[PDB]
Amino acid sequence: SFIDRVKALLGERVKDVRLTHRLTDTPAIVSTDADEMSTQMAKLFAAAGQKVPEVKYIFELNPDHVLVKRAADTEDEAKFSEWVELLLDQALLAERGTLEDPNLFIRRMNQLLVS
């Protein structure tokens, strides 16, 4: 199964993996639970000179999206990974407006753009 296949891949890097029909052009979104470290709170710590507490995100994919459908249809393992990774960074970039490794994102993006 797709969802399980993504959970396996991402392991604990994420709190959970769900499919949301919050239709739009967006293929993926990320969010935190009610009473857990929010991305907004995590930034407050950085802004106060403290190290950023871990944020367990919930990774949600749009099954109606062409890219998510594509991802799911990919048999190859490495390829299937490039997509999940690309979608996760995408959701993360939208959530926090920043990425841990911006260049890695740009690199994997362009790799799927030329292949």
Place this chain on the structure above:
Amino acid sequence: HHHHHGSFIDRVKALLGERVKDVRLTHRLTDTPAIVSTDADEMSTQMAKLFAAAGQKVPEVKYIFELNPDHVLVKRAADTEDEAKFSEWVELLLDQALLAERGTLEDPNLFIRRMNQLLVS
């Protein structure tokens, strides 16, 4: 055997206008389609943060857009005759250069929509 020809630069300049201080074609030591930079005696990215941190207000850094002539995607853009598609690739690359330089983009969602479409093209 790297003599790059065409009017690609003029085309990109026309399109970007003053959103950029200038456009150039320079090679890279990586597989990066494009980067952004600042010349000497010019407010750089870090300088800008220092400025703001000092309680000052300053205009957004007008970067120098440097496209990588040997990169597939930069070539694809130059070959695209459709002003729409062209403009789309250029916008994608410029946004990639900013993200890599500033670690952030003014409109992340717009960038994300763009790559998504282009990934499906």
